[PDB]
Amino acid sequence: GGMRLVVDGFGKYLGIENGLIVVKEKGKALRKVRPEDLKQVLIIGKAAISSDAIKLLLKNRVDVVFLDFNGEILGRLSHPLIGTAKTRREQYLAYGDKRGVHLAKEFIKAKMANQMAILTNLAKARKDSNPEVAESLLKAKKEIDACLNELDGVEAEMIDKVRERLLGIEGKASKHYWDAISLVIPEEYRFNGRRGIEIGSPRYAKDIVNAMLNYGYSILLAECVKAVELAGLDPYAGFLHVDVSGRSSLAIDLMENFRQQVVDRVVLRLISYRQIKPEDCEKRNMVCQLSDNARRLLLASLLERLDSKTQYRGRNLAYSSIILLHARDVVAFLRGERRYEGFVQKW
Amino acid sequence: GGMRLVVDGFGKYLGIENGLIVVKEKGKALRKVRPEDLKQVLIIGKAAISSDAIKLLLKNRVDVVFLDFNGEILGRLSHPLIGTAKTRREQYLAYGDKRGVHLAKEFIKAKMANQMAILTNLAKARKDSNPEVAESLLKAKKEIDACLNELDGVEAEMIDKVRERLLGIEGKASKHYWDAISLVIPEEYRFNGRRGIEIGSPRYAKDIVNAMLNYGYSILLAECVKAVELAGLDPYAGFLHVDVSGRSSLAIDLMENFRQQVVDRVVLRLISYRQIKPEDCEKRNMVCQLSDNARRLLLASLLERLDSKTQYRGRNLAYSSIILLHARDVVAFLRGERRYEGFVQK
């Protein structure tokens, strides 16, 4: 790809016209675009889509994602993949041997490394203006690095034996990370730490920062599912984050590489310029739903971030390309062609 | 086990209002259904659906299917399933051993048996009124049974070794069957033989019977894809009908069980009463395309037949339930819990 078309709001519907994908309202064209130009389309909320539109999109291998205001992935349509059986054989086989343990370890290590990167830059920005917070941040980074060195020593024949201990080490490191991030968040935002984390319970956000994080993590999760299936991998045969919850566990495992660089930094940026204020919260039950403006801003920021270029292995490429590439690297490791390594960046 | 809501045509769209699924046009409500009564919604052609309608439908475990005017499946949305990795693993492993051969043989056996069953009914109807056509039908039935008897003796360690032999025997049998069927169809329909099915590169219809067959086989393939997906199987990893076209090979394999009983009998009934006619052809592109009326009639007849009950395995079951039951039977066979058997009621 390719452009990501977004369709949201009452009365808006996607349909085809003269071979072009077209956003319409009240029978009048609003937007027109070549199917070849598209990478994906997002049908959000009240917005609707014709079967002919889905036909023209799938013919062009355009991803079609349905979403609600929470960023929850209602479902997705895409051109079918085939020949996956070999990579899937190696994938199901890897679960019983050391390859899966190495994969899970690389994923957790990648997450901790990116957390340390964000903590490092946060401390760097506050070196003079806020010495105290920078000191707290750097010490939190030191503790996370201690968790990294502890994680390096873990070894097992099978992932099932050490998944608990691994998740515990990751839980400690994540605890230090979020405790460090809380120092940077302004007092008005009421950020008391991550309560939206799905590792324990699907607890819902009562604060704007956790709402933003949950939304962005959902979008990133969609991108990771697409990347995992494009490589011929089975999304639902994960190694680390497994549950009866029904979510694609392998995509959640791959996501550990990109949670910090894609979602966290965007949220930190929007919070830093007060572009998403605490009053943007909308009370639903007791949950903090995003406002429509905050939604459109956060979504546009995340999408522009996914397609933003960065240097990796000598090339400049979009983060989404790095995600597809890492899925391919997982396939390369399953076939034994190349040892897998977690994504790492400092910026 | 719930209504199938069909949504089709220009300007029609599925929305929600007060917890009800609602078919609307130009801002005006046309139809209102509670999702609990729904089991499936069909979005066809120009028809559209909101993301909220999808959320309410998925929340009520209502299947949602997207289809073009020709009935080809585009996609399907459903409640998340867990956990099927074990099933897919055994499925991929079965390709390398005798289980895949057993499955392919059972599929072809069920197909030939059902073809023989329809030929038997066709002959019995004409025993007095048309003795020569009846005799020809019985002869074709005997040729197909000869093909079945040859099929029984085929043996292999894995499907790749013997797939062409199986396809050869199936093709001879199907040729005999379609010649016999052509004997029953009135001359004005111009049905010389079968063409355009998913087993190979498509040969699009130049006559109304082949058009009806293609449409119905497409609907049935959609239902079979749904059945294969609910069972935790991978639809694209088939055993018998492998393809360069990327077609859903496993659902196509499961479909061998059901094409005659579901599609053929309906098409034959519709032809017998002249409810669909040669002039119902519409020359879109270079092919014979069903008129909107013939299309709606055929679709409703197929859904009705799919939901109609019949006697099977000691109980009364809808054919759709039987298809789901056979996907589950395939999973049971992969797990070694139950040797598989193709669908043959008569």
CATH of the domain at B38: 3.100.10.20
Nearest of B256, B257, B236 to residue B248 by alpha carbon: B236
Residues A284 and A149 in one domain: yes
**Across the interface, which of A46, A51, A237 has its CB nearest the CB of B52?**
A46
**Across the interface, which of B45, B47, B236 has its CB nearest the CB of A82?**
B236
Residues B210 and B64 in one domain: no
Residues B58 and B74 in one domain: yes
Nearest of A220, A193, A185, A215 to residue A289 by alpha carbon: A215
Lookup result for tokens 């120009």: B46
Is A301 within 8 Å of A291 (Cβ atoms)?
no
Lookup result for tokens 């009934």: B269
Residues A67 and A91 in one domain: no
Chain B residues near residue A75 by CB distance under 8 angstroms: 54, 58, 64, 77
A47 close contact with B: CB closer than 8 A: yes
Shortest distance, CA B72 to any CA of chain A (angstroms) = 10
Half-sphere exposure of B288 (CA within 13 A, CB side): 23
Q: What is the CATH number of the domain that holds B280?
A: 1.20.120.920
Q: Of A82, A115, A150, which residue constitutes the final position of a domain? A: A82
Residues A13 and A40 in one domain: yes
Kindly provide the resolution of this structure in angstroms, with one decimal.
2.4
Name where chain A breaks: residue before each gap, C-N > 2.5 Å. Answer: none
Chain A residues near residue B80 by CB distance under 8 angstroms: 246-247
Is A244 within 8 Å of A225 (Cβ atoms)?
no
Cβ atoms within 10 Å, residue B10: 11
Identify the closest residue of chain A to B244 by CA–CA distance. A82
A160 close contact with B: CB closer than 8 A: no
Residues A143 and A38 in one domain: no
How many cross-chain Cβ pairs, A to B, lie less than 8 Å apart? 114
Give the span between the Cα atoms of B152 and B165, in whole angstroms.
12
Give the span between the Cα atoms of B289 and B280, in whole angstroms.
8
Is B159 within 8 Å of B240 (Cβ atoms)?
yes
Chain B residues near residue A66 by CB distance under 8 angstroms: 51, 54-55, 77
Dihedral (C-alpha) A224, A228, A229, A235: value to the nearest 10 degrees? -90
**Across the interface, which of A14, A50, A88 has its CB nearest the CB of B92?**
A88
Size (chain B), residues = 346
Positive or negative: CA dihedral B33, B35, B38, B43: positive
Residues B155 and B296 in one domain: yes
Size (chain A), residues = 347
B97 close contact with A: CB closer than 8 A: no
Query: Which secondary structure element, helix H or strand E, spans residue A132, and what is its range?
Result: helix A131-153
**Which method was used?**
X-ray
Chain B residues near residue A74 by CB distance under 8 angstroms: 51, 54-55, 58, 77
A51 close contact with B: CB closer than 8 A: yes
Own/partner pairs, A290-293, CB within 8 angstroms, 24+ separation: A290/A69, A290/A70, A290/A208, A290/A211, A290/A212, A290/A215, A292/A69
Total domain count, chain A = 2
Residues B131 and B279 in one domain: yes
Paired strand residues for A310: A317
Is A198 within 8 Å of A49 (Cβ atoms)?
no
DSSP notation for B142-211: HHHHHHHHHHHT---SSHHHHHHHHHHHHHHHHHHHHHHHHHHS-GGG---S----TTSS----SSHHHH
Burial B103-113 (b: 16+ CB within 10 A, else e): bbbbbbbbbbb
Shortest distance, CA B20 to any CA of chain A (angstroms) = 15
Chain A residues near residue B64 by CB distance under 8 angstroms: 75
Q: Of B58, B82, B106, which residue constitutes the final position of a domain? A: B82
Is B331 within 8 Å of B232 (Cβ atoms)?
yes
Residues A228 and A305 in one domain: yes
Contact call for B48 and A43, based on CB within 8 A? no
Contact call for A58 and B74, based on CB within 8 A? yes
Positive or negative: CA dihedral B277, B282, B287, B290: negative
Nearest of A252, A201, A256 to residue A228 by alpha carbon: A252
Give the span between the Cα atoms of B250 and B253, in whole angstroms.
5
Q: Hey, which residues 172-191 in chain A have their CB within 8 Å of chain B?
A: none
Shortest distance, CA A58 to any CA of chain B (angstroms) = 8
Query: Which structural domain, as residue segments, surrounds residue B111?
Result: 83-346
Shortest distance, CA A65 to any CA of chain B (angstroms) = 9
Lookup result for tokens 């894995």: B158
Identify the closest residue of chain B to A52 by CA–CA distance. B45
SS3 helix, strand, coil % of chain B, rounded to 5? 55, 15, 30
Chain B residues near residue A68 by CB distance under 8 angstroms: 51-52, 55
Chain A residues near residue B230 by CB distance under 8 angstroms: none
Contact call for A77 and B67, based on CB within 8 A? no
Contact call for A246 and B92, based on CB within 8 A? no
Half-sphere exposure of A226 (CA within 13 A, CB side): 23
Give the span between the Cα atoms of A163 and B282, in whole angstroms.
62
Residues A199 and A235 in one domain: yes
Tokens of residue A176, six digits: 């230090």
Identify the closest residue of chain B to A67 by CA–CA distance. B51
Q: Of B82, B115, B143, which residue constitutes the final position of a domain? A: B82
Residues B7 and B119 in one domain: no
Q: Is A32 helix (H, G, I), strand (E, B) or coil?
A: strand
Residues B42 and B91 in one domain: no
Dihedral (C-alpha) A189, A191, A194, A195: value to the nearest 10 degrees? -80
Shortest distance, CA B300 to any CA of chain A (angstroms) = 19
Indicate the pairing of strand B48-50 with strand B12-17: parallel
